[PDB]
């Protein structure tokens, strides 16, 4: 294969800024790579989105939640394509 | 309610109807009910007249029952059996703070119980983190703030203190049960008294604070309270004490 | 008459276009720099009864607001009210004293607004050894102040200064130098940071090696540097380096690990060194003493601080130069 | 089944039932059974008081059946003359059991000192029969089963401003007694 | 750029793009707020509006939305109505603008007589409990043409929730004035209108119910 991930289309957010924060906040995990954990990721997300405003987002809190979850599966499938590679190499 | 609060005060009352005398499927046996079994009946030999205030209380019961069933259906049955303070506690666990505001207005109930409930959740806030605030917003949205309504900036427990402040500014008791219950819960959960409450409740009164220093080992702080007591005696700080006498000396 | 006998305080607007002088004459004069040049007395009026000590201005991002203090046990808050606006003709702009925080029984020793990025607060210190910290809950009333905090300093207040915050984990702080000069009190500057965990100030530090009557303290602009720098003008020239090592996650405002360093020491004024002022980056020093002399300072290739110039207020300044080595 | 949905009762899962929508009649046999039950809620000779209480604790298992039995005893609750009798009716309800307990406690606080005490010289306590013991312990088993399976009954009991079993049981445990009931 | 004393909006624009190329959101927020306040000081209301929507601060949006509301009370006219009509999904970020938009929406859809969607929007906004106390005035006032309906297609349940909310807001307005009292000067004669309007309502309620019962024929 030569698969690639689907681009994120973030509406509340600036993908450049998210990826900056991602590169800054990813950490060495016990699988041999520097990647931020999903839990840390998501509640950093909630913290930062709460850091600004809060007037009428109350109704859009769903949309915030599904978009957070969707970015979660994005990173999940990033990992999912990743792990295969090294065992491909060993094989 | 509408039909009658239309009317001039002369017709402002209605007799309570007589019990029974109902059945279904006309032309049938005289007695038919879906919710049966009984052990007594209200006095029908002596009738009663029903007035705006009575009807207001019955409506309050009804609308409380519906609000209960709305936020969670499981509640209508006990709502049919719940009394005023019973619904007050059910609201304490539910979170309809402004509804309790209305209920204390109508039934003239003890706001204190509401103070303990909200204060206990607010302490759980002051100790809690992001998730606690996340749930907190879900009911804090029902309340509105004149400084600014909502803003996810700043934690929930902040506007929780502020909401208590506002509820104080808009409901008053000539007897400060509310101060006392709040402060006792604070100290029962180990809370040093907040400065804003310090200043406001001193600027109303201070010796009451003094004997609660005594009661709950607030000894150093009492010592200061005494120091500025004497100093105001020397000068003028009774305003800060909620005292009004002009001061030059002792 | 007014401001013609002595100047008690001079204040400028943010970014610099406006000026004002208050004196012991009980009146204030407000001056405006035309962008075409020349300084014009735009208004003047009485604000208090004592020798008007200081005036500090709320941010232009928060209106043309003056805060004045004196020997009056009181502090006045004047606002600029525009007569007419919206195109044709601008009516006489007038000063409305929004409120006077009267919280004092001694000399009102300093008044200072907060940085805005956490919200704007206001701090007032009195010769009582007490500081009062108000914020405006009302984002629309200019006469509203709720007193969030007060600290009993146990030392008569003389100068206070905010801690710049430029981080998502930085919480602000207050440094206080005391005009006390008793030779039995060791350390005239105290440090109190808002311990967020308790949601209230806890004392972060107090620094020894101080015994002089404090006249001026100067924070470093926060920037990305974790470490912070302080300059002190009491009767000497002191400069200190403060590296934050690490703090307890729940007692951060109570306990602080600062690598504290007496890094620059200059006694060259030979009088009461009243004042220190820094670059907008806090990178060039101007130091003023009681002898009418000001020394200018650059830190070298090795960060070493040096008097790059001497100006006499009681004499003629040293000459300008651009040809050294 | 012994809980016909004709009985007024509703929960946040009972909207699929006909207690949020009018009318429902179970089959004749179970209607007769649970109806005869509903009348036995109101007619009782004292010799059968306890095995009927075994009815009660049996049916007290399970949350929804517990809520139904709560409703049935609420029907047995309220002012009456048929749950106040040990013959011809059931000497048991929240009202019955609670006035019994409060009178026991007031008697024992006259037989013992006031609050903030355990023991003091006072008039002798109330006499207890082994039948009183059996009834009390059994009814307590029933009450515990019900409050476990039904949070609604639990909150209703804790909220009862005219009973305050909290302070009641405070005084009761301050009392010194054969500690089975303690 | 916090040492600069900005007085030239075009220079501000150049700085704006300068920040744009590297995505400094916060500086933009600060400068937009400052220049909006300059605009409001000059009473340049639309300019302050522009700076605010740049800043994305719904707080100021609502604050000057109150300007809009009370000036509409004073003059009876839609203000920056052209700006109002075409703001997009950003309405869902400011309730006071939500109010104003739904208000113009109603004026229109009523003016072309879509009473059903009028009632839908009104029921939605009341169960949203929108607008301050001096403006739940207008929320109450809105029901009059629905009263004027001499022919209705609404359901009996519809009439239910309608009137439900009518007196619900009625009690709520009684208490918003004071938690046990009312003190607004408008209420008394307004209360009179309340009785006459609910009179007409109940008569039309008899009318609607007889029609609906005959609708089952």
Swiss-Prot record, chain C:
Keyword Protein transport carried by entry: yes
Principal place of residence: nucleus
PROSITE patterns cross-referenced by the UniProt entry: WD_REPEATS_2 (PS50082), WD_REPEATS_REGION (PS50294)
Localization per Swiss-Prot or TrEMBL: Chromosome, Centromere, Kinetochore; Nucleus, Nuclear pore complex; Lysosome membrane
Ranges of the WD repeats in the UniProt entry: 2-41, 47-88, 103-144, 152-202, 209-250, 268-307
Regulation: The GATOR2 complex is negatively regulated by the upstream amino acid sensors CASTOR1 and SESN2, which sequester the GATOR2 complex in absence of amino acids. In the presence of abundant amino acids, GATOR2 is released from CASTOR1 and SESN2 and activated.
Keywords of the record: Cell cycle, Cell division, Centromere, Chromosome, Chromosome partition, Kinetochore, Lysosome, Membrane, Mitosis, mRNA transport, Nuclear pore complex, Nucleus, Protein transport, Repeat, Translocation, Transport, WD repeat
Entry's Gene Ontology cellular component terms: cytosol; GATOR2 complex; kinetochore; lysosomal membrane; nuclear pore outer ring; Seh1-associated complex
GO MF terms held by the record: structural molecule activity
GO biological process terms on file: attachment of mitotic spindle microtubules to kinetochore; cell division; cellular response to amino acid starvation; cellular response to nutrient levels; mitotic metaphase chromosome alignment; mRNA transport; nuclear pore organization; positive regulation of TORC1 signaling
The keyword Protein transport belongs to this UniProt entry's keyword annotation: yes
Family per record: Belongs to the WD repeat SEC13 family.
PANTHER family, per the entry: NUCLEAR PORE COMPLEX PROTEIN SEC13 / SEH1 FAMILY MEMBER, NUCLEOPORIN SEH1
Subunit-level organization: Component of the Nup107-160 subcomplex of the nuclear pore complex (NPC). The Nup107-160 subcomplex includes NUP160, NUP133, NUP107, NUP98, NUP85, NUP43, NUP37, SEH1 and SEC13. Component of the GATOR2 subcomplex, composed of MIOS, SEC13, SEH1L, WDR24 and WDR59. The GATOR2 complex interacts with CASTOR1 and CASTOR2; the interaction is negatively regulated by arginine. The GATOR2 complex interacts with SESN1, SESN2 and SESN3; the interaction is negatively regulated by amino acids.
Function of the protein: Component of the Nup107-160 subcomplex of the nuclear pore complex (NPC). The Nup107-160 subcomplex is required for the assembly of a functional NPC. The Nup107-160 subcomplex is also required for normal kinetochore microtubule attachment, mitotic progression and chromosome segregation. This subunit plays a role in recruitment of the Nup107-160 subcomplex to the kinetochore.
Protein name: Nucleoporin SEH1-A
Curated annotation (Swiss-Prot), chain E:
Main location: nucleus
Secretion signal, residue range per the UniProt entry: none
GO cellular component labels: cytosol; nuclear membrane; nuclear pore outer ring
Annotated GO MF terms: structural constituent of nuclear pore
Highest taxon in the source lineage: Eukaryota
Subcellular location(s) of the protein: Nucleus, Nuclear pore complex; Nucleus membrane
Family listed: Belongs to the nucleoporin Nup85 family.
Entry function: Component of the nuclear pore complex (NPC) that seems to be required for NPC assembly and maintenance. Involved in nephrogenesis.
UniProt name for this protein: Nuclear pore complex protein Nup85
Full protein: residues contained: 437 to 653 of 653
């Amino acid at each position: 294969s030569n698969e690639i991930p689907e681009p994120l289309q973030l509406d509340f957010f600036d993908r450049s800024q998210i990826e900056q924060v991602i590169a800054n906040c990813e950490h060495k995990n016990r699988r041999g790579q520097t990647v931020c954990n999903v839990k840390l990721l998501h509640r950093v997300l909630v913290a930062e989105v709460n850091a600004l405003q809060g007037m009428a987002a109350i109704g859009q809190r769903p949309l915030l939640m599904e978009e957070i979850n969707t970015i979660l599966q994005y990173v999940v499938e990033r990992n999912k394509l990743l792990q295969c590679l090294h065992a491909k190499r060993h094989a | 309610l509408n039909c009658l609060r239309l009317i001039r005060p002369e017709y402002a009352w209605i007799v309570q109807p007589v019990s029974g005398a109902v059945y279904e499927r006309p032309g049938a046996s005289p007695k038919r009910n879906y919710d049966g079994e009984s052990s007594a009946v209200p006095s029908s030999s002596q009738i009663e007249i029903l007035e705006l205030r009575d009807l207001e209380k019955e409506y309050v019961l009804a609308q409380t029952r519906l609000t209960l069933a709305k936020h969670n259906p499981s509640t209508a049955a006990i709502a049919g059996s719940s009394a005023a303070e019973e619904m007050v506690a059910l609201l304490v666990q539910a979170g309809l703070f402004d509804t309790a505001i209305s209920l204390c207005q109508t039934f003239k109930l003890g706001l204190t119980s509401i103070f303990e409930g909200l204060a206990c959740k607010c302490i759980r806030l002051q100790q809690g983190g992001e998730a606690a605030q996340a749930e907190a917003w879900e009911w804090l949205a029902a309340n509105q703030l004149a400084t600014v309504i909502t803003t996810k900036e700043s934690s929930a427990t902040d506007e929780a203190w502020r909401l208590m402040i506002s509820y104080l500014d808009k409901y008053e008791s000539k007897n400060t049960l509310y101060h006392h219950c709040i402060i006792n819960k604070l100290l029962s959960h180990g809370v040093p008294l907040p400065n804003w409450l310090i200043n406001r409740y001193k600027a109303m009164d201070a010796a009451e604070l003094l004997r609660l220093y005594l009661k709950y080992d607030l000894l150093e702080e009492a010592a200061e309270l005494v120091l500025e007591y004497v100093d105001a005696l020397l000068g003028k700080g009774h305003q800060y004490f909620g005292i009004q006498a002009p001061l030059s000396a002792t | 008459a007014d401001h013609k006998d002595l100047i008690h305080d001079v204040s400028f607007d943010f970014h610099g276009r406006r000026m004002a002088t208050c004196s012991s004459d009980q009146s204030v004069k407000v001056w405006d720099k035309s962008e075409n040049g020349n300084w014009h007395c735009t208004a003047s009026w009485k604000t208090h009864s004592g020798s008007v000590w200081r005036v500090t201005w709320a941010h232009p991002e928060f209106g043309q607001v003056l805060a004045s203090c004196s020997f009056d046990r009181t502090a006045a808050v004047w606002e600029e009210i525009v007569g007419e606006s919206n195109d044709k003709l601008r009516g006489q702009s007038h000063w409305v004293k929004r409120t006077t925080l009267v919280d004092s029984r001694t000399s009102v020793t300093d008044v200072k607004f907060a940085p805005k990025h956490m919200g704007l607060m206001l701090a007032t210190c009195s010769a009582d050894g007490v500081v009062r910290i108000y914020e405006a809950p009302d984002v629309m009333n200019l006469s509203q102040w709720s007193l969030q905090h007060e600290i009993s300093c146990k030392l008569s207040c003389s100068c206070i200064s905010w801690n710049p915050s430029s981080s998502r984990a930085h919480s602000p702080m207050i440094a206080v130098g005391s005009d006390d000069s008793s030779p039995n009190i060791m350390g005239k500057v105290q440090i109190y940071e808002y311990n967020e965990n308790t949601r209230k100030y806890a004392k972060a530090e107090t620094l020894m090696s101080v015994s002089d009557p404090v006249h001026d303290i100067a924070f470093a602009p926060n920037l990305g540097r974790s470490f912070h720098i302080l300059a002190v003008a009491t009767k000497d020239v002191r400069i200190f380096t403060m590296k934050p090592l690490r703090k307890e996650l729940s007692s951060s405002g109570g306990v602080t690990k600062f690598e504290i360093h007496t890094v620059a020491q200059f006694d060259n004024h030979n009088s009461q060194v009243w004042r220190v002022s820094w670059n907008i980056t806090g990178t060039v020093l101007a130091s003023s003493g009681d002898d009418g002399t000001v020394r200018l300072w650059k830190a070298n290739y090795m960060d070493n601080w040096k008097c790059i110039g001497v100006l006499k207020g009681d004499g003629n300044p040293v000459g300008n130069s651009y040809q050294g080595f | 089944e012994y809980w016909c949905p004709t009985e007024p009762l509703q929960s946040t899962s009972l909207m699929g039932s006909f207690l949020g929508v009018a009318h429902q009649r179970p089959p004749q046999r179970q209607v007769l059974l649970s109806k005869f039950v509903r009348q036995m809620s109101d007619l009782l000779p004292a010799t059968l008081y306890l095995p009927y209480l075994k009815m009660l604790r049996g049916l007290a298992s399970g949350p929804q059946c517990a809520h139904y039995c709560f409703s049935l005893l609420k029907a047995n609750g309220g002012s009456s003359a048929e749950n106040l009798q040990a013959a011809g009716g059931s000497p048991v309800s929240w009202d019955h059991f609670f006035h019994s307990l409060m009178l026991y406690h007031e008697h024992l606080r006259r037989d013992l000192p006031n609050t903030d005490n355990i023991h003091q010289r006072h008039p002798p306590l109330r006499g207890i029969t082994q039948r009183e013991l059996d009834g009390l312990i059994a009814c307590l088993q029933l009450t515990c089963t019900i409050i476990d399976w039904s949070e609604s009954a639990r909150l209703a009991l804790c909220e009862h401003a005219q009973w305050m079993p909290v302070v009641v049981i405070l005084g009761l445990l301050q009392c010194s007694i054969p500690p089975l009931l303690k | 750029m916090e040492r600069i004393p900005l007085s030239t909006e075009k220079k501000a624009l150049k700085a704006l793009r300068i920040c744009e190329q590297r995505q400094m959101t916060e500086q933009v927020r600060s400068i937009c707020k400052t220049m909006a306040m300059q605009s409001l000081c000059n009473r340049r209301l639309g300019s302050a509006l522009s700076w605010s929507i740049r800043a994305k601060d719904a707080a100021f949006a609502t604050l000057i939305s109150d300007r809009f509301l009370k000036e509409y009370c004073e003059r009876g006219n839609f203000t920056d109505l052209d700006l109002i009509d075409n703001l997009g999904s950003a309405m869902l970020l400011s309730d006071r603008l939500t109010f104003l938009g739904k208000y113009r929406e109603f004026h229109r859809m009523y003016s072309q007589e879509q009473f059903s969607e009028a009632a839908s929007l009104l029921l939605s906004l009341m169960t949203a409990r929108i607008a301050p106390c001096s403006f739940w005035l207008t929320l109450l006032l809105d029901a009059l043409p629905l009263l004027e309906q001499k022919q209705v297609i609404f359901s009996a349940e519809q009439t239910y929730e309608l009137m439900r909310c009518l007196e619900d807001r009625m009690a709520a307005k009684l208490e918003s004035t004071s938690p046990d009292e009312i003190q607004k000067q408008d209420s008394s004669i307004d209360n009179t209108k309340v009785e006459m309007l609910r009179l007409a309502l109940a008569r039309n309620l008899a009318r609607a119910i007889v029609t609906e019962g005959a609708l089952q024929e």
